[PDB]
Amino acid sequence: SQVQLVESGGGSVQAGGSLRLSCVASGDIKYISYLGWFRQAPGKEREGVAALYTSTGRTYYADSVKGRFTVSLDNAKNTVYLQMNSLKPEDTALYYCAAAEWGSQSPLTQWFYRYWGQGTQVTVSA
Amino acid sequence: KIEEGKLVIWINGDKGYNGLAEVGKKFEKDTGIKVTVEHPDKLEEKFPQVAATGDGPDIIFWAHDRFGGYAQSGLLAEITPDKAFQDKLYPFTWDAVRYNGKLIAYPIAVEALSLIYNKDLLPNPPKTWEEIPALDKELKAKGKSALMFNLQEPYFTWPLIAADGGYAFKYENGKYDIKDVGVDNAGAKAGLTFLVDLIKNKHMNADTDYSIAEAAFNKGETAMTINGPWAWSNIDTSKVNYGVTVLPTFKGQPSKPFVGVLSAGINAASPNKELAKEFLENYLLTDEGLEAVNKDKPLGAVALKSYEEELAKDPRIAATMENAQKGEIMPNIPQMSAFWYAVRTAVINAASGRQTVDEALKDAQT
């Protein structure tokens, strides 16, 4: 794989607080057009959280996080962020970064994405 | 019964009680209040026995899991830290000292299992459990093994078993639902199946216990073990060039070791509750206070963010905290006794083949 994604920033956070996740994309990334954040609780489904279409900057959010989370890209760093505000215990999960050159279905569906990171754990205390 | 105008503190004999006494001396130098630190014999049973009569120390130090029952028995005072103080400790450490919705002790230190590895045999330890069979085949060709750890205790096997969905008791909004047990769900079945497959394929042995694994790692016979910070001193003496790191993932998810939080509770019968709060918040739970205790006997990882950031310059402590944050806080309820016994039987029966994984976990769930 000459596209590698590495997430960081997870940890323990109190409900109502904020946390910023980072995902560094390395390799031959010039054709990437979608960057997605997904989350997966143990034994549960990997669900789309937020996605960014980099060509125009358009963002997509799951209903459960819209208004609380913000996905953004710093092109001068090849790094995509998930700023998570007003955190809730229901936000606890392993958070994955994902990337695609293009896709034929919803950019919030896991099967849209070719490249996946290793996950960073976010655990929100009530 | 407890004397007003001084502090009596009880802490176990395996802790840094002389360092804690130094914190007591600093408190006395500022306040005139004498602080007496004792390490009573048989402290685990002694505190509830004496506190039930309205006697004992002002402050008791013990692992948080026993404090749930002590709080239920009315032996511990509700503590009253303000928001600014609460923010100085990692959020998950406060979870460990909540009972009935109330904070009943101050978190001090944090303990969990980690992956311990021999750098000479294995400079790049595996990030995933799924890599271990292939790694063992490589090492067996050189007369070594990949991994040996205590399979006899659920405390050691649970991190893998529960990684993709197992849990002891469901915890939601500060309470454990004793009717919601996660022993026979799909995640626990998958983890125990992986464990039993390692045994079936001879990558691990069903009889490996604490002694067998400790001897094998410390003699350089196996590249990895799983153990806690209490084991590091023996590895030091063995001179193995070892590291301590994050436990392997399973299906991408973290291993979930049980977390123990050494905590300081205030006796409900103390007439010195405000002095105890001042001592614990403004003297002990500071960089200087924890350093004094740690210099006497290491605390491992600590709940106080500022001092943990110093201690975590030791990658072994950083790994302990990482595994702890990813782990399952040990439930502070008496139903844990039934959990240990049921899971112990399940792993014995699955690892020896008397029962399938599905049969073993179904029995442990009921």
Numbering used by the authors:
A (entry chain B): 0 to 125
B (entry chain A): 1 to 366
Verbatim from the authors:
At the core of our technology are highly stable synthetic scaffolds called sybodies, which are designed to mimic the natural shape diversity of camelid nanobodies, thus allowing for an optimal surface complementarity to the limited hydrophilic epitopes on membrane proteins. In order to mimic the surface complementarity repertoire of the camelid immune system and its capacity to efficiently target membrane proteins, we designed three sybody libraries based on prototypical camelid nanobody structures representing these three binding modes. Hence, our convex sybody library is currently the only synthetic nanobody library with a long CDR3 that mimics loop tethering as found in camelid nanobodies. MBP was chosen as a simple test case to validate our sybody libraries, because it is very stable and was previously used to validate synthetic binder libraries.
Crystal structures of three convex MBP binders (Sb_MBP#1–3) in complex with MBP were solved at resolutions ranging from 1.4 to 1.9 Å. Sb_MBP#1–3 have binding affinities ranging from 24 to 500 nM as determined by surface plasmon resonance (SPR). They bind into the cleft between the two lobes of MBP and thereby trap the target in its ligand-free conformation. In support of this notion, SPR measurements revealed decreasing sybody binding affinities at increasing maltose concentrations. A Schild plot analysis revealed 58-fold decreased sybody binding affinity at saturating maltose concentration and an affinity of 1.0 µM of MBP for maltose, which is in close agreement with the literature. An analysis of the binding interface highlighted CDR3 residues W101, Q104, S105 and W110, which are identical among the three binders. Further contacts are mediated by variable randomized residues of CDR1, CDR2 and CDR3 as well as several invariant framework residues. In summary, the crystallized sybodies bind to MBP in an analogous fashion as camelid nanobodies, namely via interactions predominantly mediated by CDR3 residues. In contrast, the structures of our convex sybody/MBP complexes revealed binding via the designed convex surfaces into a cleft of the target protein, thus confirming the anticipated binding mode. X-ray structures of three closely related convex sybodies in complex with MBP proved the integrity of the sybody scaffold as well as the utility of the randomized binding surface.
